[PDB]
Amino acid sequence: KVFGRCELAAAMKRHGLDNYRGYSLGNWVCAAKFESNFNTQATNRNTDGSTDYGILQINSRWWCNDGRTPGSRNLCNIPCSALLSSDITASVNCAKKIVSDGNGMNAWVAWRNRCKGTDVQAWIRGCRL
Ligand SMILES: CC(=O)N[C@@H]1[C@@H](O)[C@H](O[C@@H]2O[C@H](CO)[C@@H](O[C@@H]3O[C@H](CO)[C@@H](O[C@@H]4O[C@H](CO)[C@@H](O[C@@H]5O[C@H](CO)[C@@H](O)[C@H](O)[C@H]5NC(C)=O)[C@H](O)[C@H]4NC(C)=O)[C@H](O)[C@H]3NC(C)=O)[C@H](O)[C@H]2NC(C)=O)[C@@H](CO)O[C@H]1O
């Protein structure tokens, strides 16, 4: 899919991301145009060799099973292709918990710099919800 700004965003409040886990819904959206630029089809491997998966850009080394990753902990325990599909009904569960392991958004690197100290609340604006 190719999501536009509003139409790729209202879904968090649909998946329980609004005001969720101490992170208000909006802190979350700005990274989205910093992670896949509203595309769940954007993916790469890395200089670490782990491959990434979805708009989410998740690495096959610590989180899931693409199988080319040995020693991949894969705590999620679900096929990586389960995210990349434009339909996002289930894709958020693992992305939900990743902040509960105690680092929060420290999992997410861009958000620490491209949305931190920046007004993210400005990003989630303009959409009725
Ligand atoms: C193109 C694009 O989309 N943007 C790019 C992006 O592609 C670039 O690639 C990055 O790829 C990596 C893998 O290929 C993506 O995944 C990162 O990997 C990070 C590696 O440092 C990872 O950091 C670790 O996260 C751990 C969570 O599993 C944290 O664990 C803590 O471990 C302690 C010691 O390790 C332990 O004793 C604690 O119990 C434990 N606590 C928790 C809360 O787990 C830990 O915070 C951290 N390690 C350190 C340094 O302490 C990230 O968590 C992981 N992200 C996710 C969400 O999986 C990465 O997502 C990709 N980048 C981006 C931006 O997302 C990237 C290259 O920098 O550039 C982007 O622009």
Under 8 Å CB-to-CB from 129, ≥6 apart: which residues? 10, 13
**Residue 17 and residue 99 in contact, taking contact as beta carbons nearer than 8 Å:** no
**Cβ-proximal residues to 104 (8 Å cutoff; 6+ apart), any chain:** 22, 23
7 flagged as catalytic? no
Any atom of ligand 1 within 6 Å of the Cβ of 60? no
Resolution in A: 3.2
Select from 56, 41, 67 the least CA-distant residue to 98: 56
Q: How many domains are there within the chain?
A: 1
**82: nearest Cα among 92, 74, 72:** 92
Owning domain of residue 4: 1-129
From the annotation, which residues make up the binding site for substrate?
101
User: CA distances (Å), 96 to each of 34, 46, 55, 113, in order?
Assistant: 18, 23, 15, 20
| CATH assignment of the domain containing 91 | 1.10.530.10
52 among known catalytic residues: yes
DSSP states of 15-57: HT-TTBTTB-HHHHHHHHTTTTSS-TT---B-TTS-B--TTTT
Q: Of these residues, 18, 35, 48, 87, which one is catalytic?
A: 35
Pick the residue whose CA is nearest to atom 22 on ligand 1: 107
